[PDB]
């Protein structure tokens, strides 16, 4: 597969999430995430010219925005200082978010820091529209097991589950 086909599949998976808001200003993202719990996130279009996607996250000190870099067929988070081997990069932007949500399942309530440089935290998304009942069942199945090819399902539906293996 070539680069344009990988990017097209990554954008299709973005549209299947239900937490991709398209055109959305910074203030509109701040309003929707003002009272949301810490870790609530959403992906919207980037008002910047050199970017395409932006994450709006509710952190310890309020809502902020993280631009998603797309370089050499892989999606990365905007970083102030990086070592290339130490920064996660994937062909799918939903895989990038699913990667950090899984990592942040073991994040520290009382043990968390209370003042200093804010720590990143991603948990549950903020849906802009209700996804299809099929996709909701796919997420529940994915959060239950990763070996879908042993389930009592027709092969047609097993291909549907393989098209979206993420838990978020």
């Amino acid at each position: 597969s070539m680069q344009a086909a990988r990017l097209a599949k990554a954008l299709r998976e973005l549209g299947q999430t239900g937490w991709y808001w398209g055109s959305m200003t910074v203030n509109e993202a701040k309003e929707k995430l003002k009272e949301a719990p810490e870790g609530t996130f959403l992906i919207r279009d980037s008002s910047h010219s050199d970017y395409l996607l932006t994450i709006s996250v509710k952190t310890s000190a309020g809502p902020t925005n993280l631009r998603i870099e797309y370089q050499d067929g892989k999606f990365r988070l905007d970083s102030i200082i990086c070592v290339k081997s130490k920064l996660k990069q994937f062909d799918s932007v939903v895989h990038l978010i699913d990667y950090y949500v899984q990592m942040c399942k073991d994040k520290r309530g009382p043990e968390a820091p209370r003042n200093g440089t804010v720590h990143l935290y991603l948990t549950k998304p903020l849906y802009t529209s209700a996804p299809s009942l099929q996709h909701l069942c796919r997420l529940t199945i994915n959060k239950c097991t990763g070996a879908i090819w042993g389930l009592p399902l027709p092969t047609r539906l097993k291909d549907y589950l393989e098209e979206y293996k993420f838990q978020v």
């Binding site: 990592m103 804010v118 720590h119």
Partner: peptide
Amino acid sequence: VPDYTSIHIX
């Protein structure tokens, strides 16, 4: 599955 990392946002 991935090991936790303390990520700062600046």
